[PDB]
Design a protein around this nucleic acid. Sequence first.
DNA 1: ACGTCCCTCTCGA
RNA 2: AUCGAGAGGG
Lengths: 42, 391, 114, 65, 30, 56, 263, 56, 162, 56, 147, 49, 117
Amino acid sequence: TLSHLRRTNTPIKPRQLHNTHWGLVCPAETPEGQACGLVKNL
Amino acid sequence: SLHKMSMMAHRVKVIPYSTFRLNLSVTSPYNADFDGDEMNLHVPQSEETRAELSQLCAVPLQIVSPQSNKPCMGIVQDTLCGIRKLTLRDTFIELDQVLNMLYWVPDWDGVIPTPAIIKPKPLWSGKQILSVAIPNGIHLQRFDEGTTLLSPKDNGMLIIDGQIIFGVVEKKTVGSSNGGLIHVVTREKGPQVCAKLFGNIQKVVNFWLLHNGFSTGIGDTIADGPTMREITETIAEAKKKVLDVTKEAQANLLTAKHGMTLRESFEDNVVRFLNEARDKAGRLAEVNLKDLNNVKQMVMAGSKGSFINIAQMSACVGQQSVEGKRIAFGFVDRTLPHFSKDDYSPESKGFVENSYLRGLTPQEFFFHAMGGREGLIDTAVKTAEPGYIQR
Amino acid sequence: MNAPDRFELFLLGEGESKLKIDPDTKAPNAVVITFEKEDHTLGNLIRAELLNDRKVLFAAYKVEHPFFARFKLRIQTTEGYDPKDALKNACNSIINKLGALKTNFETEWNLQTL
Amino acid sequence: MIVPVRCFSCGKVVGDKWESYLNLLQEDELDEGTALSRLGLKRYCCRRMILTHVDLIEKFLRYNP
Amino acid sequence: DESAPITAEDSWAVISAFFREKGLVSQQLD
Amino acid sequence: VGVLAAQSIGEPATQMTLNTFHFAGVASKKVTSGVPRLKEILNVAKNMKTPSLTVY
Amino acid sequence: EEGPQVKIREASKDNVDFILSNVDLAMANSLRRVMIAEIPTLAIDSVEVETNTTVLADEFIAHRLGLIPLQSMDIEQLEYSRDCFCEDHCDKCSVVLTLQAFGESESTTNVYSKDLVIVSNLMGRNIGHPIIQDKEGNGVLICKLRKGQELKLTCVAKKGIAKEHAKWGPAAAIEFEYDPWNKLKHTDYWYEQDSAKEWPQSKNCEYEDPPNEGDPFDYKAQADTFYMNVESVGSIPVDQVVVRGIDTLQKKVASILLALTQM
Amino acid sequence: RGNLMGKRVDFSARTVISGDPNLELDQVGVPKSIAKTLTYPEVVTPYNIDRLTQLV
Amino acid sequence: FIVEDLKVRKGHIAKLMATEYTWSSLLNEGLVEYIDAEEEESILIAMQPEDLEPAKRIRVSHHATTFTHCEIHPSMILGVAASIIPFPDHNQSPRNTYQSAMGKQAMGVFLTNYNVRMDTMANILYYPQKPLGTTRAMEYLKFRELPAGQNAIVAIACYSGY
Amino acid sequence: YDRKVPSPTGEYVKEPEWVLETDGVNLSEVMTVPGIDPTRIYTNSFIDIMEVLGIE
Amino acid sequence: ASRHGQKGTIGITYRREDMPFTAEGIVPDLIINPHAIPSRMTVAHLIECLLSKVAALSGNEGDASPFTDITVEGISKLLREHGYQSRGFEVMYNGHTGKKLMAQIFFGPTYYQRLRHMVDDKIHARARGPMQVLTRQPVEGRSRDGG
Amino acid sequence: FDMGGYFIINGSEKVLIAQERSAGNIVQVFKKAAPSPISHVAEIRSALE
Amino acid sequence: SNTLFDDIFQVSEVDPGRYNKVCRIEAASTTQDQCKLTLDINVELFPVALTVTIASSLTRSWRPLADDYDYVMYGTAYKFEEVAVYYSFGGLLMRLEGNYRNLNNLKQENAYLLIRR
DNA sequence: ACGTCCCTCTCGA
RNA sequence: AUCGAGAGGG
Ligand SMILES: Nc1ncnc2c1ncn2[C@@H]1O[C@H](COP(=O)(O)OP(=O)(O)OP(=O)(O)O)[C@@H](O)[C@H]1O
Ligand SMILES: [Mn+2]
Ligand SMILES: [Mn+2]
Ligand SMILES: [Mn+2]
Ligand SMILES: [Zn+2]
Ligand SMILES: [Zn+2]
């Protein structure tokens, strides 16, 4: 339930885990679906 | 479902519990497994169609794939992982247990064969017992490095008139290979002859295993002997082989190689110093593990596991690769708000020196992450690239 | 849902003779009893006792599957001397051996007391 | 969701020894792995049964009716 | 005594406080 | 033998890239002169992205 | 003396300890094995509910009652409901029980195994009693009620063998070992540098002896002498759970003969 | 691409699939509840009539 | 954190531990700071205070003590869910990305008013069990107080090949 | 790069050789340069090879 | 699943008497196949279990939090002195036979979790049945019971 | 144990999810496609929010 | 049928090789000193650091006395060489070299190797 | 210009 | 029922 309350729909590379992303999004908590690492889990 | 081998016909066998149940060795051609996978089932409403599905789309009929003109099915996991446990000449069976094996073979000739020790300890051998499932009428000859007519390592494979002469069974002899026991038998003896062999072997092999048993623990990935003591220097001496080219490249002395820039020559010559670093660091463990390791014994059969998996587990993970080249400077000419600026080190361009056994640091941990994502992007995102190609 | 009933793990169904003998079609002087509603408790031990019998050759048993409770036992003996007769003995040896435990524990039990 | 009767692993009567475990660690104030060990649990299967139990029943009762 | 530095488990107590003031759905109340 | 060819060439390609997340990046998974190099071939197109005479 | 001779090690309220000398492994196993699930005992089977305001569902508590241990000493005097003659059950085949509990206490109020009560004919046989091993004697905490929660259900308690369901589990854990110094080589070890000093001597190696390394392996080494320790929740005493282990087996083999000589 | 070059089909099934060492290559362990609802036209022929009348 | 010559210290450790017996304690004391991703450019942080100053995990070094700040605990990069992995610092990065959105497809005690709340569909477990394997992060995600699984005694090995 | 060719004795041997790998493609007249092997030169552009040397 | 992307359904169900055991008479609750760890390298699955077998005997909560100098050998240091094998292995006895297993087995209490996929929720069959109205073909899904 | 955050609209607890965006009223420049007549470009996202 | 060989050898070399259940063994003779013999021999039953025979008695099934020797076995011949003969014991291989026993030895699956001392 | 195959849920005019 | 949007399962 938490993990739904901290979800960031990033509308539509941008899918990759970026260097800036340290300490904000999760390293490896994103969906193996047709929007992988598009929605990022704070 | 993108090929014939993934829409084979079967015989029914009505059973309990809500789950379709299928033979372990028809996994592959479907690429299916037992952790959440549904499967379809149809049923012809006629006779001719049944014939069409029986005399064309049968499971034994497709035992050898046209696509790659080799057998597309074969022994796997538990069976394969321990069929080499059994085809050791270290591997012996005693009086009682043997019959239990014999019986299980549904096409047994009911003749107890001439044991291989007689009196000072009546005893049978795996390659001996096994052969009763191998259809008395088969000849096979396979040689590899070191394989003599008196093969010392138990290498290759010779079996004449359907009995093991010498050699160990494994992915090569039994598995789905080209010069393979399945490819032999399906050819000269008949689709369905082979078939039963799957059974004859699965049944008799499995039995032996649950009585010898076979597991796996972290103990099968700790080689902290002097081995890890010497794997610690190759992780060191190979920083020197990249510490040299360090200030040497920033003294311009770096020989601009034919073509590539000076910059690009520094990467492409250091990654050859890190890759060969990761590699030739776990292949220092692949010999510390005695032949009585399991994951050894699991890749030594070819049941599961490849080399890379060992060095990533025991020696050192290795250099983690976004977009092909090492990590990036999404910051100011640097990689992590914990690291020097304008810095080209390995200890922060993605070389995870620590192993899985040991435990990454948050740095190492992070870069692993970035690497597999594009990996995870390759599988869910760009998996439709060739799905389009195919239509 | 497609769950079978647990009580079928023992209580024999409609007209299902507990033991069932057929003759080993190609091995001479040999039998295949299909013990129903039983398991390794029995099997392993009937068999293993058989593996003492003088004039008995083969003695071993399989479970054609773990969904079901049936298991086949196959036995072959010397010319003349009867397979059935072999199971026979092997069974008594068992219960006679068991009997001695029955009382040998109770003797020992009927000693110390806490 | 309350203490379950005996142990998943070998099925040994452990429903009972719950309330008796509480005071052992509280009233007598002692070590967890000494409170279970001194309630007659040496198999870490039973031991795992008590030590990892959350008694959410209590939050339940606390509701209006 | 206030002149002694900071260890690992020291920083846990910090984090502990972090949520006590803000919790886990901060951003979303706020 | 037609719709047979297609699956024999197409099959591999899909699992030349439905199975790169097994390791952790490495190389020729499904984004390196491969599955896309094929993307070229079938479509033809002139704008080849790595042309190269190899002259003896 | 006889044959398979034995010698207790210890004996107690809940456990019993013994070496079965001159016994065949296939036996000590098959005995072990029937001890687990094939000895009869009693345990609640059906349960109808009249009033349950508790937090735990009806069938929640349902499953919980089936697992309460019942007295089973004299149990062969009860015959399997299924194999008896009465349109469903009776007193010949089943003990009946009933549980009233109401949250009168303004504190938090407990129901136990003690709180159960038998409302059928005992017919003078030791049956149906919910063992209490409890120190406080207060039984097994079944449920919890806030001042106003009620529970009215009643429990038909029939005879079952664990083969059908664990609850009819007379047994618990059954200790099993043999041949401590792996003298029969029945198990390849696992060591990094030394096998020996890494695999610890089990607490039994002192009743067998070390092997005098210098000497070789004997290929006539047979399985004999087994170190076991059995334990019962209490539904049945621990002598009966071992001996009606033996007993059941005899009967098992027995009915072989029985249907043998029918054909 | 939806209602001709492909459609849906009566007489079809589905479920979790598990695997079986005690089974043969060419057969598939279908549960009852599918076999109770999975029919199959069959004609009345003297070679089976003495069977169909026991299934009916 | 913040570095000079690291501000907060065993004084300010205890400085609040009576609490359960202040975040705004550590920020207005100038002991801590809120650095967006842009201001992350202009700063240096040592991963672990103690580690970077002068046969276990072979550890990173320190180097040029130009350190503006220090990282609180590295473990906080983790996500809302993944935070529950037992030792992800020993697992392949794509697995962790699965356990992540797999504990989101589970069973367990989703609230405690489950009985008088009535919503469409919902699972609850029969005997929830706090994991024998706990990460410091759990404490804050109120896990052990509403677990999701049960400490299954488990053994890995081949048997029936089922 | 090594290239197998027959050592007169009869067998095949391991006599290497050099080759100039390009990063562009106009064979149309890198065909005709002297001192190469026009009868061997190869370019990935299967579309140029089509125009220069024939469909077949 | 366990907490390591380690899934799988249920293949078959067996009973304490039939299943392997340790000498103290403990039975595996569950049984995973070694053939699902080399491919993935989930080593914390391994250690979670090894730590939690201490957590068990110890009575004290086992720490899985990550960036911790808690060595593997760190754990097995204790594991040995509690009694059992230093590396978690234990001599196992074939359920069916009483015989021991020439291979010892790694054994501890790994935390697992029910997931929201039940076979009985998933199964489905159809042979003739409900029929769409514009296409006249079968209908979509277990819900509407179709093809 | 409930921690809030959510609206309750005709009964069902709906949530709102962060919609990210490249901040506005900022400047950047990105070389553009090889065959464009433009070598770089200057973009300011002009919007007073 | 009869004893189809009798030469006497002893210990030339001893080897396991990540083995420990069996050891192959190198040895040349001493009563006819112009031959070598290499035998995969189980060491659980009979170790070494000493005669030998072949025979074929003292198809058809098998029953639970030639037992005058000590270590015994039964293999099969599969290929013979010349100047050498190769037997297989369902995995255990064995080679000996000579030119004499053309009359006794013959290429069969027959074989009851023996030893003693 | 089309943009991998199938499957299970849940919800607003 | 129909179209539209949404999360998961291989
Ligand atoms: N996006 C997808 N498209 C097509 N097929 C898929 C897709 N995802 C999974 N599959 C199918 O599922 C199977 C493999 O997926 P799955 O994740 O089960 O693999 P896996 O190896 O078990 O997972 P793990 O990789 O964690 O072990 C293949 O048969 C594959 O075709
Ligand atoms: Mn996957
Ligand atoms: Mn899988
Ligand atoms: Mn799968
Ligand atoms: Zn227990
Ligand atoms: Zn009655």
